[PDB]
Structure formats: structure tokens, C-alpha cells
Design a protein around this nucleic acid. Structure first.
Ligand SMILES: [Mg+2]
Ligand SMILES: [Mg+2]
Ligand SMILES: [Mg+2]
Ligand SMILES: [Mg+2]
Ligand SMILES: [Mg+2]
Ligand SMILES: [Mg+2]
Ligand SMILES: [Mg+2]
Ligand SMILES: [Mg+2]
Ligand SMILES: [Mg+2]
Ligand SMILES: [Mg+2]
Ligand SMILES: [Mg+2]
Ligand SMILES: [Mg+2]
Ligand SMILES: [Mg+2]
Ligand SMILES: [Mg+2]
Ligand SMILES: [Mg+2]
Ligand SMILES: [Mg+2]
Ligand SMILES: [Mg+2]
Ligand SMILES: [Mg+2]
Ligand SMILES: [Mg+2]
Ligand SMILES: [Mg+2]
Ligand SMILES: [Mg+2]
Ligand SMILES: [Mg+2]
Ligand SMILES: [Mg+2]
Ligand SMILES: [Mg+2]
Ligand SMILES: [Mg+2]
Ligand SMILES: [Mg+2]
Ligand SMILES: [Mg+2]
Ligand SMILES: [Mg+2]
Ligand SMILES: [Mg+2]
Ligand SMILES: [Mg+2]
Ligand SMILES: [Mg+2]
Ligand SMILES: [Mg+2]
Ligand SMILES: [Mg+2]
Ligand SMILES: [Mg+2]
Ligand SMILES: [Mg+2]
Ligand SMILES: [Mg+2]
Ligand SMILES: [Mg+2]
Ligand SMILES: [Mg+2]
Ligand SMILES: [Mg+2]
Ligand SMILES: [Mg+2]
Ligand SMILES: [Mg+2]
Ligand SMILES: [Mg+2]
Ligand SMILES: [Mg+2]
Ligand SMILES: [Mg+2]
Ligand SMILES: [Mg+2]
Ligand SMILES: [Mg+2]
Ligand SMILES: [Mg+2]
Ligand SMILES: [Mg+2]
Ligand SMILES: [Mg+2]
Ligand SMILES: [Mg+2]
Ligand SMILES: [Mg+2]
Ligand SMILES: [Mg+2]
Ligand SMILES: [Mg+2]
Ligand SMILES: [Mg+2]
Ligand SMILES: [Mg+2]
Ligand SMILES: [Mg+2]
Ligand SMILES: [Mg+2]
Ligand SMILES: [Mg+2]
Ligand SMILES: [Mg+2]
Ligand SMILES: [Mg+2]
Lengths: 46, 110, 118, 117, 56
RNA sequence: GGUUAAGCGACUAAGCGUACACGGUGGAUGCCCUGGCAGUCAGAGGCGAUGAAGGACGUGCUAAUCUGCGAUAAGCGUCGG
RNA sequence: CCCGGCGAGGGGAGUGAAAAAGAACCUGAAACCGUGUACGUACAAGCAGUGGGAGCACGCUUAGGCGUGUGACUGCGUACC
RNA sequence: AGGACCGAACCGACUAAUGUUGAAAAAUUAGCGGAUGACUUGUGGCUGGGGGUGAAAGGCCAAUCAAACCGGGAGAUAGCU
RNA sequence: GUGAAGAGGGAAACAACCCAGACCGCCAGCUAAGGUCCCAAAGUCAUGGUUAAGUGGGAAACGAUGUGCGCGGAAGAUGUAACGGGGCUAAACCAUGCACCGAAGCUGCGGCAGCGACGCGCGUUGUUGGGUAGGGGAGCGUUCUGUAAGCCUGCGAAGGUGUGCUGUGAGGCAUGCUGGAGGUAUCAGAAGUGCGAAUGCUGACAUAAGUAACGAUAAAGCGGGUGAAAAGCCCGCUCGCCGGAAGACCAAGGGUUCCUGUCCAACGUUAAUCGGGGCAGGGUGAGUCGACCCCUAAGGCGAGGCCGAAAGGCGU
């Protein structure tokens, strides 16, 4: 069975990456929330 | 003079080792080594090493001679269990307990 | 029910059994003593000793039977040139099965089977 | 002022489990089962403190009946005669005498028979 | 189908009453080497019935 | 005396139960506090294009991670303690 | 030092006030699992107790019964929420 | 020539059996349908929740769908258990 | 009226029927309902009648030379099974009588408590004490604060675990062992104050059970090596399987799994000397391969711009 997660680094970075998050204010708020929570990994980037 | 050997965290369930332990309880140690030699169990190898260690402890630390020694007390206690996850069908996970045991042999001459 | 039936299945199908006993007969002929499980040794008697009896009479046809069996010219040559004459007078019982305890890996009853004149 | 329940809970559980000594299986090991066992045991003990008197009176009457019929009178007539003779020995003592003094019980039987005659 | 009641340690012991291993009745002693061995089995030093049957 | 007959009859524990002794497992309990929680009195109420918050990578006699630091890299100068 | 696989684990020795404080480490409860001992248990039917109760074992200190453990047999008795 | 025929790759999923605490949260085995097309497939892109998409089944939209998931209102409300 | 919210005795068993309302203790007595052959306590009781059907111990309409209450009618499916059983010719039925048994009822003895009356908290006395929802009263215990820079405590605290004593209870005290540094009277004060249930939550540990299973029925055998140990590791010889793949090379994806040495706790559904496991070391070399780069597609972003409460949407 084809499972739901079919990895693609390009698609991953484009849809969830740092620059994608910074592109919109809602993404920027995601980043602000993750910084407030103290996440070691802000995005899928690293 | 009682002399003890323990094998703590023996990797075998206490129920499997107690079968072998029952064979030699109260036996003369030469007879016990004979019995363990021809018992076709893993627990036989484990218990035999414990018994030989006990006999050697008696001879060396306590000065006793092997001909007088009997397996005065033998018991197997449960040691800590290692907990493992063995997947089953349909995404259900089952826990595997990998049980260990503490083998204690007490040899004495009287 | 298996009344009066003979031959051990040994948890193998027929082709595997036949191939395994061909191999094992070859090993027994070339080494003259092999260590195998007791049931396999007991069934191996019934495969090897007929080979030796066949080897008692040296002919082209007999050598071709001993080659159709065992499929090995090393083994056929040893049979007809050594074991045949070595056992020329002995009427059967060319092998000897010596029980030798238990296999460590799986507690199988092990046995040495050897040619009697080794 | 947080209160940890450990010591007090251990004390109550230990108390019940001590009362449950001798019971089979979980009934002496397991507090849920032991507590039920101890309560039922107390219930039984209360009921039996009553039943003990009935059982012993029944036993005394049986022994008195046996001894009286050995002396030729049934318990009914024997007790009736002792009432008639104004003899107030009770069944416990009467049964003790029946077992241990056949002569004294024979005297009592004769006294009762005289009263009934 | 599955139990309704936890079987007791008593019943577990009763079931296991037949699980005890039987020790080897007694060993044989080779007439030549003097080593003990299972009867009808070669000794650890390769003896059987007083014969060195396997070298080494 | 012995035999026979009749009657009655303990001694067994494969295991199991109860009690006790000694253990194992487990990590409760008690005790503990470099952690928190709530405040009081003060302080400061911002940081950032002189590049922030937050990171990446690096940096040691250093293999790792943490702390510090930034190719001048567990630190450089100067003034004072 | 010794057994052990140049193991694991253990027994000694030593340290220590204490290793039954040995790092799987303060105290170490209970479930659960054992070993030893006493008693019972293989003609016996059911909430497994309770009332009666023999026998046995054990500890006793007017030498007497007492205490403790067990519980043959027997009356009654269908858990808790 | 052909939404032509038979038939592998490939796409599907009609039947039966097995499996159904599976080898597998949908498979395996034996058969079956399409197999130059309204085909199939890689990579990338777009459509976002009362919204999308739908050769239309209330189908599908991350094993979730007669209204996704996550956080919040929120300790909703519960004459009920 | 009882149960609900009520135990006890009887009706075999049997909430609601009968008797009777449990304050506690007693190895005393008398009774109720109901009983008195044995199970099973008490009459194989007495007197006088009836029944022959096991009626008693299931039932009609109707029918019968039964007899001084009895018969047929009267068939069910696991087992007698429509007396509780054994059994009973009374141990059935009726009447009379006297006995006895029979309850946690009554009485006796000892104890506790509530309420009230009389007299000075005490006494005397009467009486009461089943209990759910619920109301009232009185306490126990836990943590913390004051008392308390007190008191106890290394001559052993808390905790744990036994034992004994003690109270109506919650409980309390003492003490052995363990433990090794805390505890805390008293009277007050405050509560995260008491658990067996919530298909409660978390951890631990059981059960089924040493059971099912060990994951493709392509398949192994033997010799040698190494090793503590080899079915599985290495070598060899056979053997079998794939071969439009189960071979080879990449992309994506992964990220050191690669190679060597070493180790075998854990991991590997077994063993393991072996390993994609632990540990250490090594290994990836580009002008030409690829990316980057140049160029664009779908699409994205988008100076200005247009639009929009704001956010923002579209777009040159
Ligand atoms: Mg899965
Ligand atoms: Mg035959
Ligand atoms: Mg097999
Ligand atoms: Mg074939
Ligand atoms: Mg506190
Ligand atoms: Mg206990
Ligand atoms: Mg059920
Ligand atoms: Mg079994
Ligand atoms: Mg026992
Ligand atoms: Mg060591
Ligand atoms: Mg300390
Ligand atoms: Mg400890
Ligand atoms: Mg314990
Ligand atoms: Mg009989
Ligand atoms: Mg008996
Ligand atoms: Mg039974
Ligand atoms: Mg009964
Ligand atoms: Mg076509
Ligand atoms: Mg489809
Ligand atoms: Mg079938
Ligand atoms: Mg198919
Ligand atoms: Mg077609
Ligand atoms: Mg076709
Ligand atoms: Mg529809
Ligand atoms: Mg879905
Ligand atoms: Mg909605
Ligand atoms: Mg609201
Ligand atoms: Mg709620
Ligand atoms: Mg109600
Ligand atoms: Mg009643
Ligand atoms: Mg009754
Ligand atoms: Mg009353
Ligand atoms: Mg009677
Ligand atoms: Mg009848
Ligand atoms: Mg009639
Ligand atoms: Mg008929
Ligand atoms: Mg019948
Ligand atoms: Mg009376
Ligand atoms: Mg009474
Ligand atoms: Mg009364
Ligand atoms: Mg009351
Ligand atoms: Mg305290
Ligand atoms: Mg205080
Ligand atoms: Mg609370
Ligand atoms: Mg409750
Ligand atoms: Mg089974
Ligand atoms: Mg089976
Ligand atoms: Mg099986
Ligand atoms: Mg396999
Ligand atoms: Mg080999
Ligand atoms: Mg293999
Ligand atoms: Mg090979
Ligand atoms: Mg690695
Ligand atoms: Mg490799
Ligand atoms: Mg392994
Ligand atoms: Mg090993
Ligand atoms: Mg590796
Ligand atoms: Mg464009
Ligand atoms: Mg735009
Ligand atoms: Mg603009």
C-alpha cells in the first residue's frame, strides 16, 4: 500500500520550510509561537 | 560453613530455571554436577556454572573439600524484566517481558 | 496410521530428502565418518550400504548405477576401488552408528555414523 | 497544607490484612478481597455468637436424651419430671452429668420418675 | 474463548505438577577410560565400550 | 506360641493450602532540596540597520554535549577591585 | 586472590560507622514470585468464612493448663459496589 | 484505421479460499478486467473546510469526513450515567 | 400489613407469607410461628375414630355394589423430580389432652449508651437503643502554624516490620528488629485531611502460559577453521532457488547503514564467534558526471499600480 508520507525534500521545504513560514504573517506567527515555546527546531529546515 | 554463589540477572525466566534447580536440590555436589552435565537445558548450563562457582568458592575461600559438599540450598528468584515491544497485526503493539532471574546456590558440608 | 511403512520423512519433501541423502552418502563415502542427527544416520544406513553392496561387483553397469545414485565420480571411484574390495567379504552392516550426545544449537540427538573398517 | 495519605492508608490496609490472616488466596493477600473477607467474617461471628448457644443447647439436649433413654425415659418426660420435682439443674450441667456421672444422672432420672409417678 | 476468573497460583502449581524434569537415572562408566557418559553414548573423550572410537 | 479369620488402622504429597522465617521483584513511604508556586519591597520598563529576538556553524590539549565566546572565538586591551 | 568465556555474575579480601550504603547504590511498603520449616490435604462437591472441634507441632514460667501455628470432622453460610 | 481483438510489462480489483490478537490497520494465493487510450506514470504546480474536488459514491481532501486537522472560546452544556 | 429501610425462627430453598422488631456479652432458662421416626432439636406420646388410595404427597365436569375418608377422571419432553430426602399403613387424616423442642421474642446475669422524672456533676428511678434517603450530636486520625531557641532524639527520630497491652470505634501506648536524623506534647489555628470501586489516572506486577507464535513450503548436507560453546559465522565440496530478477546501475528517499579491527550486555523473534548492533579507526578526490550556473513552463513572488475595515487580494 502506498502510504500517506511520500517524502520529498523539495516539497517539504517549499510547503513547511523556513522561508515559506516567513513569507506570510501566519507563518511568521507560527515561528513566533515556536520560539515562545522554545522549540529546538523551528521548522523542517534543519 | 555454608558457601554461596549467585548469578544475578541470569538471562532466563525463573520458571525455566527452577526446573533445573529442582533436580540438584539436596544432592551431593559431584552428583549435582553429573546431573547438570546431562540435563539438556540452557538453565542447566547456567545453574552448572553457578554450582561450580559455589564449589570453587567453598574450596578457596572456606577451605572445604569438594567431596563433603552438598547442594544445601538452591533457589531461583525473579530478576528485573526487560520490557520490549513486539508489534502485532493491525498496528497493535504487544509488550514482551524478557524475564531474568537470580540463581543462588548454597553448598555446605554439613 | 503408518502401519508397516518405512522411511523417515524428516520434514522434507521427497526431492529434498533424496538430494540430501545423496549428498550425505557422498560425505560418508569420502570421509568414512560423519556426524549427523541420529534419525538421519539411521536413514543413511539404508542409502549408503546398498551403494557398497552394489560396489561389491565391479562392472560398467554397476558403476553407472552408482553414478545415477550419488551422482559423483569421486564417490563412485572410491566405492568401487576401495570400499567394494574393503567390504568384499562382509555381508552387510558396513556402517556403524555411534550416538554422541546433543547438538548445542537445537538439542538434536547427534550420532557419528562411520564405515566399520575405518 | 497538602496531606499525603501514604502512612495512614498503609496502616488501615495493614490492619485489615492482619485480620485476614489464614484466609485462602487473595483473601489474605489482597486488600479489596481481604476487606470483604474480614467484613463477612465479622458478620458470621456476630451471627454465630447467637448460633453457638443454639448449637450447644441442641447438643446438651441430645446427650440428655441419650442418657435418659439409657435410664428408661425420654427427654420430654425427663425434663417434665424435673420441672415437677422443682429441680433446676440446666441442660448444660445435666449433659455434663450424663457424660461424667452415670450414677448421678441415674439419681436425677429416678427423681424425675418419682415426680412423674 | 477466554477465562472469566483469574486462575489461582494453586491451579498454576497443580498444572505444573507434571512439568518437573527427570534427572538422568545414572551414568555409565567406560571400562577403559573410566569416564562417565550417557549409556549408549560415546564419552566426551571419544570412547565407547572401552574403544577409542573417534580420535580427538 | 504359631497359623488362619474378622475388624480396625497410622506412616505417602505428584502437587496444593495456611502460618512463620528468610529472600527476590518493585519502588511506595519517611526524610531531603541547587526545582517550582504565590507574593512583597524596590528596579527596569524595552531590544533593533552601530544589525535585534532567535538560531546555524565554529571555537579548547578536546571525541561529544552543555556553558562562555566569535576566525582576536572558555577569549583580547585598559582602568579599578 | 578465586570460579567464570582475558565474560556477565558472584565469593573472598580491603575501605567504610554501615557494602544487607557497591554505583541496577538512603529508607526499601504492597501486589507478585520463591526457598526452608510446622501442620493439613489424593472418597471429596459450592462466596472458602464462621461456631464447635479432635489430632499434630511449637513456646511455656504454680506442672498445670496456657499461648501460637495448623484445622480432620461438623452446624450455618449464594462476594462487594 | 480502430476509446478494434488476444495477451505480458503496467493499471485495476470480479470471484473464491486463506488471513481476519494478519506477513498486511485491506493483503496473499488461484483465477479475473483494461492493456494506443475517456490509458498509465515520474517530477513540479494549483484548488482549503460550509471550502475544494467529484464520469456523482455523500466519494475523496495525509489510515480521520453527512463537513479535515490543530490551537483557542472551554472547566461549553449534560433535568443523564 | 410487610419489604423498601428489618436481621432472627418457620414456610425445603423462597424481599413483600407466618412468628417476631437485633444496644453488647453468656457453653443459663421460658416461649411464638412451626414442629417432635432418621437426615435434624423435641412424643416411634396417650385416648378414641378414618384411610388401603402411598390417598396423604397436583386439579376439575362426570362416572363407580370402595368404606365408616377414599377410586377413576390424571399425558411431556436431561433425572426419580407434583412428601425437601430417606422412608412411613402411621411417621397419613380428625378430635381431645398432657409433654417437650423451637427465635437475636421474653426472663436471668454482666456491661454500655440515649432520653425523662425525682434529689442533692453525682445518685436514684423509669424507659429506650433495626435502620436507607436524610436531620442532629460527639469524636479519631493526617499535613501545616503558634505554644516551641520548649520537649523527645545517634544511649537511635521519621519511616518500615513484628509483638504485647489498651479504648465502644476511628484509634492510642509500649516494645523487639530494621532504619540512620529527625520528631513533636498540650491547647488552639488552617486544611490539597482519610478511598475499594468512577469501562478513574500513573507506575509496578499477575493471568491465560512456558500456551500461540518465531513472518512466505526456494532446501539443505557434510568436512575443516575459529571459538567457552557452531544448524545458522568463515573456508571448501555438494545441494537447491532466482535469473525481464530475488542480477546490475541510478533517481527519489535515507544518512555512515560503506571498509577494517574489536566486543557480544541490549538489539537480531533462537544461538551467535556473525550483523545494517556497541566501540574505535578508515573511506567519498571531477574543467568533461551531477548540482550550482545560463534559459525558460506550469506556477510563485512582485517596485510602482489597481483593489480592499485592518490583515491583506490581484497584478505590470
Ligand atoms: Mg503497519
Ligand atoms: Mg517395518
Ligand atoms: Mg520442523
Ligand atoms: Mg520436482
Ligand atoms: Mg509538606
Ligand atoms: Mg502475606
Ligand atoms: Mg465476566
Ligand atoms: Mg505443561
Ligand atoms: Mg509449601
Ligand atoms: Mg567481576
Ligand atoms: Mg544519610
Ligand atoms: Mg536500597
Ligand atoms: Mg516485602
Ligand atoms: Mg463410594
Ligand atoms: Mg482421605
Ligand atoms: Mg471441588
Ligand atoms: Mg451449607
Ligand atoms: Mg482495445
Ligand atoms: Mg478504482
Ligand atoms: Mg478451505
Ligand atoms: Mg492476482
Ligand atoms: Mg477487451
Ligand atoms: Mg487484453
Ligand atoms: Mg446516498
Ligand atoms: Mg482517508
Ligand atoms: Mg459544522
Ligand atoms: Mg464560555
Ligand atoms: Mg467538562
Ligand atoms: Mg430505594
Ligand atoms: Mg425477614
Ligand atoms: Mg431456612
Ligand atoms: Mg430493638
Ligand atoms: Mg432427634
Ligand atoms: Mg401426591
Ligand atoms: Mg375423581
Ligand atoms: Mg401414551
Ligand atoms: Mg422421566
Ligand atoms: Mg420448653
Ligand atoms: Mg435463644
Ligand atoms: Mg431482647
Ligand atoms: Mg439506631
Ligand atoms: Mg514530618
Ligand atoms: Mg505543632
Ligand atoms: Mg482529597
Ligand atoms: Mg465506595
Ligand atoms: Mg491452553
Ligand atoms: Mg497446543
Ligand atoms: Mg506451535
Ligand atoms: Mg524466517
Ligand atoms: Mg559444520
Ligand atoms: Mg539455516
Ligand atoms: Mg558456504
Ligand atoms: Mg551507526
Ligand atoms: Mg558491512
Ligand atoms: Mg540473542
Ligand atoms: Mg552466550
Ligand atoms: Mg556496525
Ligand atoms: Mg511567470
Ligand atoms: Mg501577486
Ligand atoms: Mg506594493
Amino acid at each position: 500500500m502506498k502510504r500517506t508520507f511520500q517524502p520529498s525534500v523539495l516539497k517539504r521545504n517549499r510547503s513547511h520550510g523556513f522561508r515559506a513560514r516567513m513569507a506570510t504573517k501566519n507563518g511568521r506567527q507560527v515561528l513566533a509561537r515556536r520560539r515562545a515555546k522554545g522549540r529546538a527546531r523551528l521548522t523542517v529546515s534543519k | 560453613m555454608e558457601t554461596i554463589a549467585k548469578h544475578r540477572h541470569a538471562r532466563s525466566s525463573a520458571q525455566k530455571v527452577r526446573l533445573v534447580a529442582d533436580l540438584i536440590r539436596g544432592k551431593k555436589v559431584s552428583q549435582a554436577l553429573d546431573i547438570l552435565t546431562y540435563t539438556n537445558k540452557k538453565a542447566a548450563v547456567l545453574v552448572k556454572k553457578v554450582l561450580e562457582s559455589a564449589i570453587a568458592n567453598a574450596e578457596h575461600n572456606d577451605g572445604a573439600d569438594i567431596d563433603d559438599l552438598k547442594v544445601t540450598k538452591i533457589f531461583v528468584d525473579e530478576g528485573p524484566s526487560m520490557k520490549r515491544i513486539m508489534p502485532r497485526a493491525k498496528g497493535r503493539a504487544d509488550r514482551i517481558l524478557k524475564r531474568t532471574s537470580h540463581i543462588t546456590v548454597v553448598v555446605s558440608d554439613r | 496410521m503408518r502401519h508397516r511403512k518405512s522411511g523417515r520423512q524428516l520434514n522434507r519433501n521427497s526431492s529434498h530428502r533424496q538430494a540430501m541423502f545423496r549428498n550425505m552418502a557422498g560425505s560418508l563415502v569420502r570421509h568414512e565418518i560423519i556426524k549427523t542427527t541420529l534419525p538421519k544416520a539411521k536413514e543413511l544406513r539404508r542409502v549408503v550400504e546398498p551403494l557398497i553392496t552394489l560396489a561389491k561387483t565391479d562392472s560398467v553397469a554397476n558403476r553407472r548405477l552408482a553414478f545415477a545414485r550419488t551422482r559423483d565420480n569421486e564417490i563412485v571411484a572410491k566405492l568401487f576401488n576401495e570400499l567394494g574390495p574393503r567390504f568384499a567379504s562382509r555381508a552387510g552392516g558396513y556402517t556403524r552408528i555411534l550416538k554422541c550426545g546433543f547438538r548445542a544449537g537445537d538439542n538434536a540427538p547427534m550420532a557419528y555414523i562411520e564405515l566399520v573398517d575405518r | 497544607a497538602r496531606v499525603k495519605r501514604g502512612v495512614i492508608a498503609r496502616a488501615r490496609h495493614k490492619k485489615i490484612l492482619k485480620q485476614a490472616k489464614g484466609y485462602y488466596g487473595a483473601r489474605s493477600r489482597v486488600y479489596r478481597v481481604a476487606f470483604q473477607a474480614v467484613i463477612k467474617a465479622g458478620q458470621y461471628a456476630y451471627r454465630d455468637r447467637r448460633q453457638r448457644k443454639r448449637q450447644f443447647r441442641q447438643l446438651w439436649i441430645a446427650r440428655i436424651n441419650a442418657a435418659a433413654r439409657q435410664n428408661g425415659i425420654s427427654y420430654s418426660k425427663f425434663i417434665n419430671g424435673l420441672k415437677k420435682a422443682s429441680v433446676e439443674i440446666d441442660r448444660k450441667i445435666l449433659a455434663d452429668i450424663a457424660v461424667f456421672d452415670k450414677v448421678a444422672f441415674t439419681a436425677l432420672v429416678e427423681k424425675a420418675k418419682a415426680a412423674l409417678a | 474463548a477466554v477465562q472469566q476468573n483469574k486462575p489461582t497460583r494453586s491451579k498454576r502449581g497443580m498444572r505444573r505438577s507434571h512439568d518437573a524434569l527427570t534427572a538422568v537415572t545414572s551414568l555409565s562408566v567406560d571400562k577403559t577410560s573410566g569416564e562417565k557418559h550417557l549409556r549408549h553414548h560415546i564419552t566426551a573423550d571419544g570412547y565407547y565400550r572401552g574403544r577409542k572410537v573417534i580420535a580427538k
